[PDB]
Design a binder for this molecule. Structure first.
Ligand SMILES: CCCCCCCCCCCCCCCCCC(=O)OC[C@H](CO[C@@H]1O[C@@H](CO[C@H]2O[C@@H](CO)[C@H](O)[C@H](O)[C@H]2O)[C@H](O)[C@H](O)[C@@H]1O)OC(=O)CCCCCCCCCCCCCCCCC
Ligand SMILES: CC(=O)O[C@H]1CC(C)(C)C(=C=C/C(C)=C/C=C/C=C/C=C(C)/C=C2C=C(/C=C/[C@@]34O[C@]3(C)C[C@@H](O)CC4(C)C)C(=O)O/2)[C@](C)(O)C1
Ligand SMILES: CC(=O)O[C@H]1CC(C)(C)C(=C=C/C(C)=C/C=C/C=C/C=C(C)/C=C2C=C(/C=C/[C@@]34O[C@]3(C)C[C@@H](O)CC4(C)C)C(=O)O/2)[C@](C)(O)C1
Ligand SMILES: CC(=O)O[C@H]1CC(C)(C)C(=C=C/C(C)=C/C=C/C=C/C=C(C)/C=C2C=C(/C=C/[C@@]34O[C@]3(C)C[C@@H](O)CC4(C)C)C(=O)O/2)[C@](C)(O)C1
Ligand SMILES: CC(=O)O[C@H]1CC(C)(C)C(=C=C/C(C)=C/C=C/C=C/C=C(C)/C=C2C=C(/C=C/[C@@]34O[C@]3(C)C[C@@H](O)CC4(C)C)C(=O)O/2)[C@](C)(O)C1
Ligand SMILES: CC(=O)O[C@H]1CC(C)(C)C(=C=C/C(C)=C/C=C/C=C/C=C(C)/C=C2C=C(/C=C/[C@@]34O[C@]3(C)C[C@@H](O)CC4(C)C)C(=O)O/2)[C@](C)(O)C1
Ligand SMILES: CC(=O)O[C@H]1CC(C)(C)C(=C=C/C(C)=C/C=C/C=C/C=C(C)/C=C2C=C(/C=C/[C@@]34O[C@]3(C)C[C@@H](O)CC4(C)C)C(=O)O/2)[C@](C)(O)C1
Ligand SMILES: CC(=O)O[C@H]1CC(C)(C)C(=C=C/C(C)=C/C=C/C=C/C=C(C)/C=C2C=C(/C=C/[C@@]34O[C@]3(C)C[C@@H](O)CC4(C)C)C(=O)O/2)[C@](C)(O)C1
Ligand SMILES: CC(=O)O[C@H]1CC(C)(C)C(=C=C/C(C)=C/C=C/C=C/C=C(C)/C=C2C=C(/C=C/[C@@]34O[C@]3(C)C[C@@H](O)CC4(C)C)C(=O)O/2)[C@](C)(O)C1
Ligand SMILES: CC(=O)O[C@H]1CC(C)(C)C(=C=C/C(C)=C/C=C/C=C/C=C(C)/C=C2C=C(/C=C/[C@@]34O[C@]3(C)C[C@@H](O)CC4(C)C)C(=O)O/2)[C@](C)(O)C1
Ligand SMILES: CC(=O)O[C@H]1CC(C)(C)C(=C=C/C(C)=C/C=C/C=C/C=C(C)/C=C2C=C(/C=C/[C@@]34O[C@]3(C)C[C@H](O)CC4(C)C)C(=O)O/2)[C@](C)(O)C1
Ligand SMILES: CC(=O)O[C@H]1CC(C)(C)C(=C=C/C(C)=C/C=C/C=C/C=C(C)/C=C2C=C(/C=C/[C@@]34O[C@]3(C)C[C@H](O)CC4(C)C)C(=O)O/2)[C@](C)(O)C1
Ligand SMILES: CC(=O)O[C@H]1CC(C)(C)C(=C=C/C(C)=C/C=C/C=C/C=C(C)/C=C2C=C(/C=C/[C@@]34O[C@]3(C)C[C@H](O)CC4(C)C)C(=O)O/2)[C@](C)(O)C1
Lengths: 312, 312, 312
């Protein structure tokens, strides 16, 4: 199609730059400047809104394209093959076109607010400046093709079941774990501290399992889960804690997403994460909250998962 | 005997409830409500007094019964066999009967003071309520049989050697390590943070080695060590630190207990604990005190253990 | 030679004491009393000045003697063989004689200022007092022989290249990493907390690789690197941070030292250290500074090492 053909031209203009970027740099785990949790949450919210509006089949295709790309990484910089680079850009171009322009610009505007003005210059300083410029020009040409195919209105909200077994169980899980949820420091920078002894390539293989799971999940269930998070962000208090009702809706929605893929797909994610998560991490998190409430939340979770397991 | 026969009936009434309890829940490592170190210490003191008054042979028998019970654990809830459940209840019933009623009630009263009123309800909410009630009724019947065989007066204090080699060495160890003892935060909740990466079943196998060692130890030496701790609790200051003289008496008493079992029994405990203790734990403890005093205490300990080793 | 012959007599008088010292005691990692970072830095500075003035070939010989001595350690106290003890004392005696008396006394005076008056007594209390006294008398006799051979003037400063590839690269590394250097708490006691799960004998084998590397390094490059550190100490601010220019000079000097030994020698040090450094240590250090600046410093380092690698 058009976007696919345009992606090939984008590749001719940008692959040199892609080969120069040090993709294994740990700096990408950090905020693009000073961390501002609540301001960053507004940007995440715009992305969630956009994700919920995008075509589920195109999102699925874009996830598969990244899974394929991870398989061809090579060299010390961790760059994917030229064919995969084009495949990813085409798939993302299609996703962008499935959403109205204002949604895309909202993301750009909110991310700009939290990005330090010096970030682009520092990033360009690590590569060949001419190649970066050449890549950007390629991008400007590519976005015109995407724009021509872009829709003018957003698709409607997902269908949410009511009173299903998962929804009822999620209510019990939520009441039991809300005290624990309120104790977590949602505004801490600890979440961006790296995993001890794990390289970027090791982390990538674990993230790959999640990408694969997302590609397999029910598109509507995923869309509803994103919508539930957007609503939850609207009710947060000053410390970032959402309302008990919105928390319950988020848990029910996630339970339906889990039940939409086979058990083996979910276990692959768990096993991969268990391989990269130092045992001191769960302990460090546990030590910052009330130990009775953490155990109450955990017991409720192991009870809730039996209902999800039966539906799955 | 009577208690043995009554334990079998207690089992018919309570084993269903025992099978329902999730014994692997980590909540049991936590205080039954808000942690109140000094108030909890009063309850531990009542238990120590009771332990020192109990018949040493019956305490030994009850420890052996638990060691046997650990060997038959099965299922996801970690429940011991019906035969072992009865064996444990009978052995404990006999221990309770070897101590006067007021001592037993003192424990109950002091533990009630630190237990949150909502604890029993929360525990009952996780099992079949009817089965719990049935188990409690079984307990009320069982305690009447125990009461009929209960002594009316407490046995006398243990015999403590004087000026033996261990007692003299303990004096040197105590003088050398008291500065370190004073620096430890005895009122901290860090002691109840779980062992990183260790399941309840793994911890249980390590605790089993200690139970085995206790069953092998000299009953009089154990009794004297408990009495020494009761005295030490009497002289604590506002931060929970006992007097130097009481500390020395505790060290001498523990040294005698160690020398009452063969070296292999003590090494089995050490090796099992080494297997479940993350190397960051000793470091975390060390970092909270004066490093010179911790090394002075450690050097004194490695010197003291040579005297215990020779006596053993 | 004279010092060699005198070392043999020193050995007859001191080896008994050497066998009694518990060399595996972790107390030697701690300051000899209360930690006083800035006062201790003055003592290190005197040692640096002395090291830069000593004969490079004699320093190299003394390093080799320690490497040999590590190979003959035996027993629970970690004592080297009698032959190696003498070899070490002789080699050190020769180093001491290659430097003027005032430099040696300066070290003694500055170390005395930070050492608690009770340290010698505590150390003597752990060994046979008569043997310690006998060893000290042996030392007093030995130092007279060293004194007779001692030079009267210090050798001149090392020759430093200018505008070489390493020097230019060091400038870029220093500019990129200075913000990170300023954020580190140079006055913290964390640097003296032990390595989790690593015995003194395990640490010794890792330190052995560094001793071997130092013995292989270019004597002039080492001398220049020591001189660069002495200058750097002169420009520190109140928090212990040296000037940007002195920092750059230190980096260039160290880069030349690294390029003066083959790659395999440097990798042996890295592999040995990787074996004793818990993965939580780099994380703990990273969590105390700005994460963006740490990643910028790291990226700059991986770029700088390519220039060192080519020169090597
Ligand atoms: C644990 C939690 C998980 C984490 C959560 C997710 C993390 C979210 C944070 C992501 C951080 C993104 C930061 C990367 C910055 C890259 C933006 C870029 O370099 O920006 C470069 C631009 C270009 O600047 C240029 O500056 C000038 C130079 O161009 C000139 O030069 C020539 C080519 O060289 C051309 O011919 C051009 O026409 C000519 O004018 C011109 O004005 C250009 O038109 C242009 O404006 O800078 C600008 O716009 C201004 C800067 C804008 C700020 C960044 C927003 C834009 C892109 C990000 C939004 C997408 C969302 C990302 C996250 C979603 C997925 C994770
Ligand atoms: C550790 C490691 O190894 O990680 C490895 C992981 C991988 C995955 C293997 C890997 C890879 C590949 C990667 C990351 C590729 C990333 C590609 C990103 C493409 C992003 C695109 C196209 C974004 C857009 C946004 C658009 C917006 C367009 C508009 O808003 C514009 C402008 C103006 C509006 O008026 C109109 C508009 C039309 C609305 C556009 O049209 O397109 C790599 C490199 O190997 C690294
Ligand atoms: C198309 C699209 O865009 O997709 C995008 C969609 C998203 C959602 C945005 C996205 C994402 C993120 C994803 C998928 C997250 C996935 C999370 C999965 C979590 C799974 C968990 C917790 C699984 C487990 C399994 C466990 C098992 C525990 C036990 O067995 C144990 C050990 C021992 C037994 O004795 C008992 C037991 C208790 C039984 C456990 O306890 O937990 C992504 C990647 O961006 C892609
Ligand atoms: C900065 C900021 O303020 O952020 C704010 C952002 C928000 C969004 C507003 C906000 C919020 C709400 C949040 C985060 C809620 C998160 C909820 C997460 C729920 C996750 C769930 C249910 C995961 C699972 C995984 C499951 C796996 C089940 C199985 O694998 C198991 C075990 C065993 C297998 O044998 C069977 C199986 C079935 C395969 C399951 O059953 O369920 C908050 C708190 O306000 C913070
Ligand atoms: C992680 C894990 O797997 O852990 C596993 C570990 C094991 C060991 C294998 C295991 C097990 C077994 C367990 C815990 C059994 C516990 C049994 C406890 C029995 C307690 C008893 C009888 C207590 C009492 C107290 C009494 C008091 C009586 C009186 O005061 C009363 C009322 C009134 C006074 O007027 C008179 C009185 C007479 C003075 C009584 O008479 O009796 C299990 C379940 O498998 C879990
Ligand atoms: C009937 C009854 O009720 O019984 C009850 C009685 C109690 C008491 C209440 C009870 C209990 C608790 C018990 C038993 C506690 C037992 C504690 C044992 C501690 C043992 C220790 C520290 C052993 C060691 C061994 C070590 C060895 C170190 C070395 O070898 C090492 C590595 C390397 C060599 O080169 C040097 C070395 C230095 C030689 C070490 O350094 O330490 C229980 C369970 O409730 C039951
Ligand atoms: C909250 C509250 O306030 O709590 C307060 C409670 C108190 C009680 C009032 C209180 C107090 C005092 C306390 C805790 C004192 C604790 C003393 C513990 C002493 C432990 C000892 C000696 C253990 C051992 C183990 C030994 C093992 C020896 C061997 O294995 C070794 C190595 C090697 C083998 O080859 C040979 C061996 C021989 C087999 C040994 O030789 O000795 C305080 C501080 O006030 C706090
Ligand atoms: C964990 C472990 O196992 O570690 C193991 C590591 C090893 C290396 C294997 C090991 C070993 C060996 C060791 C440490 C040996 C150390 C020897 C130290 C010797 C130091 C010497 C001679 C120092 C001096 C200083 C002198 C100063 C002399 C003067 O100033 C004096 C007075 C007065 C002035 O007027 C004149 C003067 C002339 C200027 C002197 O003349 O001599 C061991 C023991 O096995 C432990
Ligand atoms: C005669 C005399 O007195 O000598 C005295 C002289 C001194 C100087 C005072 C002295 C001393 C101290 C000494 C020698 C210090 C030595 C320090 C050596 C540091 C070496 C380092 C950092 C080496 C590395 C190697 C690395 C490799 C990283 C990578 O390969 C990795 C993993 C993975 C690849 O994919 C990428 C990669 C990135 C390539 C790394 O990242 O770092 C001593 C002992 O007192 C003796
Ligand atoms: C208490 C107090 O205040 O202290 C004050 C003391 C001071 C001194 C005044 C002060 C200061 C300055 C300081 C500490 C600066 C320290 C700089 C250290 C630089 C170390 C460097 C360059 C090490 C290396 C190692 C290298 C290894 C390279 C390789 O192995 C690599 C990777 C991979 C192989 O394949 C190839 C290779 C080539 C073999 C290299 O390339 O470089 C400060 C800050 O003021 C604090
Ligand atoms: C159901 C579900 O799971 O959904 C999940 C799905 C996902 C995908 C996993 C997910 C996600 C992430 C999301 C949506 C990412 C969104 C990315 C959006 C990028 C937008 C970009 C780059 C927009 C712009 C706009 C630009 C404008 C540039 C110009 O106008 C400017 C200024 C000025 C000049 O005059 C002209 C110009 C030069 C043209 C441009 O430069 O770029 C999420 C949140 O997890 C939800
Ligand atoms: C030498 C040495 O090593 O000793 C060591 C030995 C050990 C064993 C390891 C050790 C230990 C722990 C110890 C001693 C545990 C003691 C447990 C005691 C439990 C006591 C209980 C349950 C008592 C009660 C009383 C109750 C009363 C109930 C009723 O009256 C009530 C309210 C009102 C109604 O009208 C009638 C009623 C319903 C009848 C009941 O409900 O329960 C220690 C401390 O380590 C020392
Ligand atoms: C190029 C490079 O890499 O260099 C590196 C090389 C090294 C070696 C690795 C290095 C290092 C460390 C250094 C230099 C160590 C220096 C040690 C010096 C020790 C000096 C001592 C013991 C001096 C004294 C003086 C004393 C005086 C005693 C007496 O006068 C007293 C009071 C009073 C009586 O009346 C007479 C008396 C009894 C006679 C004595 O008792 O002892 C460094 C810093 O890393 C740099």
């Amino acid at each position: 199609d058009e976007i696919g053909d345009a992606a090939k031209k984008l590749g001719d203009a940008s692959y040199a730059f892609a080969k120069e970027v040090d993709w294994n740099n740990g700096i990408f785990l950090q905020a693009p400047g000073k961390l501002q949790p609540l301001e960053a949450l507004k940007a995440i919210d715009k992305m969630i809104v956009m994700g919920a509006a995008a075509d589920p089949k195109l999102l699925k295709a874009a996830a598969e394209a990244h899974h394929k790309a991870i398989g061809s990484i090579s060299g010390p910089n961790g760059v994917t093959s030229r064919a995969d680079w084009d495949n990813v850009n085409a798939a993302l171009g299609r996703v962008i076109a499935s959403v109205p322009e204002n949604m895309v610009m909202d993301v750009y505007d909110s991310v700009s607010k939290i990005t330090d003005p010096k970030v682009p210059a520092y990033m360009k300083s690590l590569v060949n400046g001419a190649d970066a410029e050449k890549a950007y020009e390629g991008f400007l040409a590519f976005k015109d093709v995407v724009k021509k195919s872009q829709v003018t209105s957003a698709a409607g909200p997902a269908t949410v079941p009511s009173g299903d077994k998962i929804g009822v169980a999620a209510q019990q899980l939520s009441e039991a774990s809300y005290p624990f949820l309120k104790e977590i420091d949602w505004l801490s920078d600890v979440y961006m501290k790296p995993l001890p002894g794990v390289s970027a390539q090791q982390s990538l293989k674990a993230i790959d399992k999640m990408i694969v799971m997302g590609a397999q999940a029910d598109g509507n269930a995923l869309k509803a889960a994103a919508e539930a998070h957007h609503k939850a962000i609207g009710s947060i208090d000053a410390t970032g804690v959402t309302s008990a009702a919105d928390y319950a809706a988020v848990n029910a929605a996630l339970g339906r997403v889990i039940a939409s893929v086979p058990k083996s797909t979910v276990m692959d994610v768990y096993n991969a994460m268990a391989g990269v998560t130092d045992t001191s991490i769960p302990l460090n998190m546990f030590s910052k909250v009330n130990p009775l409430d953490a155990n109450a939340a955990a017991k409720a979770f192991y009870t809730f998962k039996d209902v999800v397991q039966a539906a799955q």
